[PDB]
Amino acid sequence: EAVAAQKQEQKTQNQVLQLIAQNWKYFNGNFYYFSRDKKPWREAEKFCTSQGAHLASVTSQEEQAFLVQTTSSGDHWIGLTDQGTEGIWRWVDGTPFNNAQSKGFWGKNQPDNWRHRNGEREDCVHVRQQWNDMACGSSYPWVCKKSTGWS
Amino acid sequence: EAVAAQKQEQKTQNQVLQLIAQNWKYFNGNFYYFSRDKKPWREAEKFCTSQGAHLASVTSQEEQAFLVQTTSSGDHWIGLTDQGTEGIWRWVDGTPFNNAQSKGFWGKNQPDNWRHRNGEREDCVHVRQQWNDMACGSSYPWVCKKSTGWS
Amino acid sequence: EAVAAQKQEQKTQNQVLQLIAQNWKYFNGNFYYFSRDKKPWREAEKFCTSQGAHLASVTSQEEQAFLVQTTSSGDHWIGLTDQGTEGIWRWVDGTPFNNAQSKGFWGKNQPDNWRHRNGEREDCVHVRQQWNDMACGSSYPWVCKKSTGWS
Amino acid sequence: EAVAAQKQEQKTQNQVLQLIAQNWKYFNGNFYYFSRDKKPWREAEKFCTSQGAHLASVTSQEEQAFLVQTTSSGDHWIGLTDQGTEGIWRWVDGTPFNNAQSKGFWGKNQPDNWRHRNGEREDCVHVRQQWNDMACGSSYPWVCKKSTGWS
Amino acid sequence: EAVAAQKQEQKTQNQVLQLIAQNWKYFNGNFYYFSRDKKPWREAEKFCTSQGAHLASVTSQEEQAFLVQTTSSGDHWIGLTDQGTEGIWRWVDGTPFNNAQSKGFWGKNQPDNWRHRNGEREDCVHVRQQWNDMACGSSYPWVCKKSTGWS
Amino acid sequence: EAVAAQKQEQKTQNQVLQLIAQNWKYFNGNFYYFSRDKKPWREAEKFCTSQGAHLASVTSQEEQAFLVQTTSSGDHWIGLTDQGTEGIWRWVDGTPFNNAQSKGFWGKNQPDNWRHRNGEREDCVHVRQQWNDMACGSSYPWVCKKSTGWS
Ligand SMILES: [Ca+2]
Ligand SMILES: [Ca+2]
Ligand SMILES: [Ca+2]
Ligand SMILES: [Ca+2]
Ligand SMILES: [Ca+2]
Ligand SMILES: [Ca+2]
Ligand SMILES: [Ca+2]
Ligand SMILES: [Ca+2]
Ligand SMILES: [Ca+2]
Ligand SMILES: [Ca+2]
Ligand SMILES: [Ca+2]
Ligand SMILES: [Ca+2]
């Protein structure tokens, strides 16, 4: 009859306070953080990791709407990249990426892997209203994603 | 021409040095860290998060072997739990499971969800040679897993 | 001018990361791998070959110290055997050997070529603190050795 | 332009490979080596010097935890000693000590400067779980510490 | 009595079948594989290692004849290279080489260390009728060598 | 009684003989070595390490006089460098320095971080009569410093 479940849930109940108290927004199972600073892609991921998150992914399409309409009028990094090999893309969190449906989320003609002035290709993806591969060294803001068993 | 890919690599290169320099061991795409201290399940996860990792998962069975022979004669936390709801288990990183082999790796009669004296059920999993659900407040060592596009 | 090299170096520099990332230890020019599993002598060699190595040899005596103190309290296969002809021993990597120097490394009364209960002689050598010829079918751990032009 | 920094970074990037390839472990700025052999205090220091290091020091307390939990259940020399004059201790690397701190790391009643059977006092410090001054001629293992501008 | 030598021989007897079944040719103690594809020097070596071999060496001169007349009208990598230091050559398998009988095996004016159009020197050796150092990035076929106690 | 302190002192007494026998000069607690050859900054440091020393530092100003008048009419490396980040200087031995101090020891307009012809900045310091940051690849002589509990 000694139910310490109150304490267990209390611990989770507290964890989400720290998140929303730091302006993490909840959406369909995950917590998302839209950054206020702008940093490179690698530097952006080091942040999401420090906060136990990764650069957001897209398991669905309505998820992209949440981002886009939250980042409409804004370029925000995400967790896609084809560094290791120029051909294959892959999410940094672990999600395998359904190349099939991943179409439409790219710009009308994208990815292009454009050659930038400072001798860089494009191996990192950001979002304004559809994805665009970009030079990773460029300092954009970003969005982290975090999973929870909380609803 | 002017290819900073040398600079791009060099950076990833460096990232892996920091890992193995802190005794992260590589195995089939991911890096694993076997802790030297012992802490509760959440405290163990707060650590793996701090290092941009999560408590190891099992996408395969040969993966579990790697753990076992590195954790043989040792109980190590992992990222499984049926906390949110007592029935459903789920990995903390995101990996879906449930046959999904998800079997044989448990003890001969496990999980049992035993009722501990002070004063909790069992909602966290560790490994000695096969999984066992355990009271989360208990301070065991753990194993983190980290993804890379490096091989 | 245009000096790749780096790309060269970069390439060699990467090769050693994969090794130590898989827990290969460096010693006086060579890389050594001390196994975590236990397998027969041939199965141990099939592994060392797959990883571009062979079961360690002894060009020197200080080398044996490195092994012994790394495998102290442990029986580890090595690349010696007199299978082809029961009299002559020979290293599997290619190194020619001199029983002259190879003496002292054997037990006080060794090799013995003992007859085991199963119809095997002893044609394979392992180490605890000094060599002992052993039945090859027996599943001991092992040590591989790998050469490099890296220091 | 023509920037050899790569080459400069490649040089350092190589230096750390040589270290971890020989089982130097990184911790909060420094590299630490936990020996596999056991030797006297001076002989232990002659080694750390040969490898451009000195017998580990303790600028902090979290450092001692790193040592202790890597040497837990193990006696390891360190770079403290009161030879020159029996009263004052001093680190061999150069680090100044004698804080109101530096206490608590000792046994319940330590240092004692015990008189050993082979006419030796105790002028050297080792660690099992807290410091103890010891006869320097005694052959313990040791830990070296090395500094770097690498993180 | 119970003589498992039949099984021991059968295993060796089987090992050579897999080799010649894959077109490994025997010569004076060793097995040699002449590749059907063409790959760089490093890519070529990863193959020979995977197959428990190394890029062929020359312990003798009649060995070179076997290679040359098996590859007459063909450029084949071999296990020589002066990568580590531009001056010293060394075999990748381990064989030390007198570097005094080595003369005669080189082209009439070789090695030259020619500067190629792409920013590479020549640090790898192939054979047409006598050795020539070559740019390692160049995609030639190759020959592996494997040792055995079989005759 | 049986006081092996004679043997203990004799060992230290021997260490200093080896030093001055190799022309190490004593000054206010430390031993200094002024090299007879000239080598790069890194090559110079590898030496001081081999001799259980590091490139000299300056805890005081009267110390600098000893160096300057011992190296007057001579450029000698020291253990300062602003590698890692172009801004911060730091001693290679470990000494934190009186950045508030450390002025006056530099040239009238120094450091300058001049851009050298072979694409190098200046990240290493030598001394003629006052400090000057210099290209590390340049081969100057040097001075090592060594600590002792001997006076
Ligand atoms: Ca790309
Ligand atoms: Ca683009
Ligand atoms: Ca449960
Ligand atoms: Ca249980
Ligand atoms: Ca035998
Ligand atoms: Ca035997
Ligand atoms: Ca004392
Ligand atoms: Ca004592
Ligand atoms: Ca060459
Ligand atoms: Ca040529
Ligand atoms: Ca500088
Ligand atoms: Ca200057």
From Swiss-Prot, chains A, B, C, D, E, F:
The chain holds residues 393 to 543 of 548 of the full protein. Disulfide bonds join C48-C144, C124-C136. Residues 46-146 form the C-type lectin domain. The gene is Clec4f. This is C-type lectin domain family 4 member F. It comes from Mus musculus. Receptor with an affinity for galactose and fucose. Could be involved in endocytosis. It is found in: Membrane. Kupffer cells. The lineage of its organism: Eukaryota, Metazoa, Chordata, Craniata, Vertebrata.
